[PDB]
């Protein structure tokens, strides 16, 4: 049977927001900062592009570019709450744009072979526009779920 | 009782709203759909009403070319009616009766209902190609084996009417099956290095077969020539997708346009109280085909240029090929315009 | 031998009023015995007053069990109460009595043969009766067909999916079992079938002696018209000729009381002379005759044929006690 | 009378609005419906009126080839009648009569004898309802199988006779027996236009119904593969089936527009109801030996008079109802060979 | 299990919920008008975006953290502003109709079989989501009719 991509979007957004809520329930500041960053991220993507947003997420993480593999990021290994929220947001966005909701899921991921930052690095503008639409949609879902079930500030 | 059948391609250039007032629903004003399938449809009574209205206007304005010659209904009335012709034209001048060719083809006015019937039987406009947005490319023209089977079954009607053989042989090789997670689409929509296409919000694996789209494309050339309503047909072959029946049904149900119209109080400058209603529109660039069946003109005392059905057919083909109509009514807001391209089969 | 005749479609039986071009509305009446008799005559002629006798016709319903339905007697009130005529010597008149008031409305419907074996005694159960709607409905087809005025209305008999018409034929005169023949007005047909005589008949046939001796000892007899009869001697009269009951052995009759509806007016087409048959008046089916006979009845069968045209199916009467 | 019979089949290519009804509940002109059951029906009186007219117009064009030999009605009447047969030719061409061979088959005209055939009512056999999976479904009722069970025994009856008695299924108001193309994957349930149905497991009832259809309407099914149909039968309860036929038919609003103002005219608005397309009807055709009136040598017995009717009407396309000019009525017919 | 019994259940349920809202919030007409407008606007949102999208959008207007997506745990009286109360009541009515119908005793007991409709959208196939979409549109039509009948703005 077929599954609509919106269902995968909702499932991924709920999974990530519930995961951050459960892992850092005591950390009110982390939840508030993550909610603010999720609500502010789509505007940054629209104004400066998806690649600039992805790199700016890593700029606050203090990690360098060109070594950006999202699988090799431990988002809990950052002391600051802002760093934790930025790492969570970047990991969620990159995971969605690289693998979707899993291989078996309806959405297997757009890039599917490497990190979306590298995808934006060395691919044509039509593909980055498709990735920008996908990122905006998943960001809208994540923002909705965070504003609903995560504590604000 | 019917000797010739002429198809009627319809290509919407503006959103089309065929109103369906027989709906117990206040959410919006829906377009009529085939109840047992949900596909959008235009009833023949609506289609014939705009055909007859347009044809009557041309005859009144003396624009119809018959046998490559101009038609004068006033002069032909004297040749046809002689006595009482002056009395008859008074009714037409009073908008009580329709001109001769209009009454011959579509039928007489309401007052003269029992005098005779028309010569044509305007069929029902059914879906053939639906435009849905796609990730790669602006959009895609979508169909399904159920629509293809319906189209092939329609040629059997024409083949039996004209006692033809090659007509049923056109799609005799069409055996296309599609899983729910499969599709057959052109190269203008396939995502790079993935063999996937994303229509609306559905990811569909692309099947590896090119004959299905090729034979389908040339079928439209038989009915519509190479000029695909103002554009080369090969330019749009690359954006034609074949999806499963269930997936196509979802596109027909939900991808139709929904517009939130409103009215505003002039004095207050804001929306008037209770003045808010939403409508549903068929998307533009939607391809629908009808099937007009025409028999011998029932009314006698008729000129030689409209003697048989073959004579009648050439009148419809000439006056309607590459012509723009207004099906359904939202004319004052520029909705309903559709390109029409007729043409007999092989 | 019963003759099950299940209608494939609705049936229309022409009422005597003409219907060609002017009386476009054509109503329907219950199937007269002459129509079914002619249909059976055609059936036997294809297989190989007719020489063979048709006892009568009754409706039937086949829902698991196969039961024949007899027309609702005029002796039953709408509250399932019997009516008995008792005479008033003080006033010198006889009135019909239901023990619940001097006025009553006959119960329209049917009565199964189990009802018959109990109704003849003088009591009726609840399950023994069936309403009319459970068997057939008056389906009226409209606008069937220079033809602007030819649109004519027709009312047909829409039998239920488990209900049909059964024709009772005496033992013997065997013919084709399964087949199809046309019956009625506007051309229609039924899927008839030949079936062995139902167990209900033998149930009533075996128990005939008990009711017969009860009638003999009580000096009272009631006669129930299953099918309409033409009881006139010279013309057509509802008065029961005393000689008619003399055939069964009635030495004398004291008083005869009869209750029935409006008479049925009918005719036929004489195929031999290509002219309509003489018009006849018959006492409607379901009427009951209450008599005070002197003597005894020696009839071996629980039924007898009264009047003329008894071979067609007319005059099927049952002897009962009151 | 009516020594044998033949089975006809109908399939609405376009929605059909034939006749009317005396009920007139909501729709101004409903469709012809049975009284006791409420099913949609095509009366044999109106069905004969289009069967005979189509047969008549063939005679004027001489396309009634009998025993693979074309029929010429002009000479046939002269050959079998003579004397006034020339006047008979004139009367037929005067539209005051009808061709000779048709009147043997379909009865005389208004101006003797009777037609050798009778047209039964067209009882419904398959009804289309919108589904969730398997976009549309052919729904039946167990008693509809029962009606088909008795009628089909008149012609076929012997293998089909044995399998005919096997049609006996009891269904609750929510259970159903459906093809694979309609059952929702995983959740063993079927949705048919807002109604949720639970699939009842079986392996004979649907196969038996499609078995008799192939044996009575050929391997092909009205221009569609037979196997593509077997996956879309959805037998439902009688109350469910009865309710569907009352409410799942297309009610079409209609109105007349005056060009003087461009709006609608006051009081010129009404609603008419149409039988849905893809509705497999079937009508039993009863045929008997025609009246002996010096008939031609090709129409003596009943077996010869049924072959002409079956051959000339198989795979035909005639219009029923009173909406021919708006593409309503065309039905494909498949006589039962 | 016909169409008309389903329509009866829809009418009864819609009248019940609209009457409950009218009685409980009779004094404040602001919440009544907001609920009426939100109901008349809801089905079109479902048509344009989808049942999952509008369900998430309703859940995002609660001005309070939610532990987990669940219609039973909601309590619209807690919120202060009329907007949040109206959104919460509409979401609660929609979800309870889609999950329980008009109760287990009634003929229609819902589609999701007790699950939260958001979860049903999350993990079910597209066909089931479409069916739930049609059911939600029908019940929202009935709710809009009754709200326009009774609620005053």
Curated annotation (Swiss-Prot), chain A:
Record flagged with keyword Ligase: no
Pfam families: Cas_Cmr5 (PF09701)
Record-level GO BP terms: defense response to virus
A GO term from the CC aspect: cytoplasm
Record's keyword annotation contains Cytoplasm: yes
Keywords assigned by UniProt, alphabetized: Antiviral defense, Cytoplasm
Primary residence: cytoplasm
Matches recorded under InterPro entries: AF1862-like_dom_sf (IPR023101), CRISPR-assoc_prot_Cmr5 (IPR010160)
Superkingdom in the source lineage: Archaea
Location within or outside the cell: Cytoplasm
Matching SUPFAM superfamilies: AF1862-like
Family: Belongs to the CRISPR system Cmr5 family.
Function as written in the Swiss-Prot or TrEMBL entry: CRISPR (clustered regularly interspaced short palindromic repeat), is an adaptive immune system that provides protection against mobile genetic elements (viruses, transposable elements and conjugative plasmids). CRISPR clusters contain sequences complementary to antecedent mobile elements and target invading nucleic acids. CRISPR clusters are transcribed and processed into CRISPR RNA (crRNA). Part of the Cmr ribonucleoprotein complex.
Record's protein name: CRISPR system Cmr subunit Cmr5
Organism, as annotated: Archaeoglobus fulgidus (strain ATCC 49558 / DSM 4304 / JCM 9628 / NBRC 100126 / VC-16)
């Amino acid at each position: 049977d077929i599954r609509e991509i919106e269902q995968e979007r909702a499932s991924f957004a709920f999974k990530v927001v519930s995961d951050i809520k459960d892992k850092y329930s005591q950390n009110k500041k982390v939840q508030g900062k993550y909610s603010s960053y999720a609500e502010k991220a789509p505007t940054i993507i629209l104004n400066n592009g998806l690649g600039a947003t992805l790199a700016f997420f890593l700029s606050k993480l203090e990690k360098p570019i060109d070594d950006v593999d999202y699988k090799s990021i431990n988002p809990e290994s950052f002391g600051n709450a802002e760093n934790i929220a930025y790492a969570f947001l970047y990991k969620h966005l990159s995971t969605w744009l690289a693998e979707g909701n899993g291989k078996d899921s309806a959405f297997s991921g757009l890039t599917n072979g490497e990190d979306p930052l590298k995808y934006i690095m060395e691919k044509t503008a039509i593909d980055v526009a498709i990735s920008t639409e996908e990122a905006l949609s998943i960001l809208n879902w994540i923002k909705k779920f965070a504003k609903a079930m995560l504590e604000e500030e | 009782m019917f000797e010739k059948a002429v198809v009627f391609g319809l290509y919407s250039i503006t959103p089309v709203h065929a109103g369906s007032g027989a709906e117990l629903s206040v959410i919006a004003l829906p377009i009529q759909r085939e109840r047992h399938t949900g596909f959008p449809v235009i009833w023949g009574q609506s289609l014939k009403g705009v055909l007859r209205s347009r044809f009557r206007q041309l005859e009144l304005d003396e624009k119809i070319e018959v046998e490559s010659q101009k038609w004068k209904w006033k002069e032909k009335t004297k040749e046809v009616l002689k006595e009482k012709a002056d009395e008859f034209i008074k009714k037409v001048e009073e908008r009580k009766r329709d001109p001769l060719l209009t009454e011959i083809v579509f039928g007489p006015a309401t007052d003269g209902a029992s005098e005779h019937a028309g010569a044509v039987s305007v069929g029902d406009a059914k879906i053939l190609l639906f435009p849905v947005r796609s990730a790669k490319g602006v959009f895609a023209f979508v169909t399904s084996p159920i629509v293809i089977q319906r189209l092939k079954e329609d040629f059997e009607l024409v083949s039996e009417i004209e006692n033809d053989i090659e007509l049923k042989q056109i799609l005799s090789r069409f055996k296309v099956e599609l899983s729910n997670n499969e599709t057959i689409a052109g190269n203008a929509l396939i995502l790079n290095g993935e063999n996937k296409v994303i229509l609306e919000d559905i990811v569909l694996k692309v099947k590896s077969d090119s004959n299905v789209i090729e034979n389908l494309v040339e079928v439209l050339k038989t009915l519509f020539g190479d000029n695909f309503f103002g554009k080369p047909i090969e330019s749009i072959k690359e954006r034609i997708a074949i999806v499963s029946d269930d997936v196509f049904k979802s596109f027909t149900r939900f991808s139709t346009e929904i517009v939130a119209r409103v009215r505003i109080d002039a004095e207050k400058g804001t929306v008037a109280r209770g003045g808010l209603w939403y409508e549903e529109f068929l998307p533009s660039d939607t391809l629908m085909y009808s099937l007009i069946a025409v028999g011998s003109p029932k009314k006698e005392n008729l000129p030689k240029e409209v003697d048989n059905t073959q004579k009648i057919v050439n009148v419809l083909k000439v006056t309607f090929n590459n012509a723009f109509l207004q099906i359904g009514g939202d004319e004052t807001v520029g909705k309903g315009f559709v390109k029409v391209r007729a043409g007999v089969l092989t | 031998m019963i003759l099950v005749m299940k209608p494939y479609d609705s049936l229309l039986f022409r009422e005597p009023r003409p219907f060609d071009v002017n009386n476009h509305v054509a109503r329907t009446i219950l199937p007269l015995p002459q129509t079914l008799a002619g249909a059976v005559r055609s059936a036997i002629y294809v297989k190989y007053e007719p020489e063979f006798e048709i006892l009568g016709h009754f409706f039937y319903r086949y829902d698991g069990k196969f039961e024949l339905l007899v027309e609702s007697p005029h002796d039953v009130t709408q509250n399932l109460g019997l009516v008995k005529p008792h005479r008033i010597d003080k006033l010198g008149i006889t009135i019909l009595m239901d023990s619940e008031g001097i006025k009553f409305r006959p119960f329209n419907g049917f009565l199964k043969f189990s009802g018959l074996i109990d109704y003849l005694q003088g009591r009726i159960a609840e399950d023994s009766v069936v309403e009319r709607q459970k068997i057939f409905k008056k389906e009226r087809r409209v606008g069937i067909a220079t033809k602007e005025e030819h649109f004519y209305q027709v009312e047909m008999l829409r039998f239920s999916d488990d209900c049909g018409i059964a024709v009772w034929v005496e033992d013997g005169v065997d013919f084709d079992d399964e087949g199809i023949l046309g019956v009625g007005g506007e051309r229609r047909f039924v899927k008839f079938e030949k079936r062995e005589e139902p167990e209900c008949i033998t149930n009533l046939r075996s128990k005939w002696k008990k009711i017969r001796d009860k009638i003999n000892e009580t000096g009272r007899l009631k006669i129930y018209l299953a099918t309409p009869a033409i009881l006139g001697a010279k013309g057509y009269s509802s008065k029961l000729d005393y000689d008619l009951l003399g055939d069964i052995g009635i030495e004398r009759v004291r008083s005869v009381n009869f209750i029935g509806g409006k008479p049925v007016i009918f005719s036929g087409w004489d195929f031999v002379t290509r002219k309509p048959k003489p018009t006849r008046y018959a006492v409607p089916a379901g009427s009951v005759y209450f008599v005070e006979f002197e003597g005894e009845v020696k009839l071996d069968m629980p039924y007898l044929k009264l009047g003329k045209l008894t071979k067609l199916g007319y005059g099927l009467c049952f002897m009962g006690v009151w």
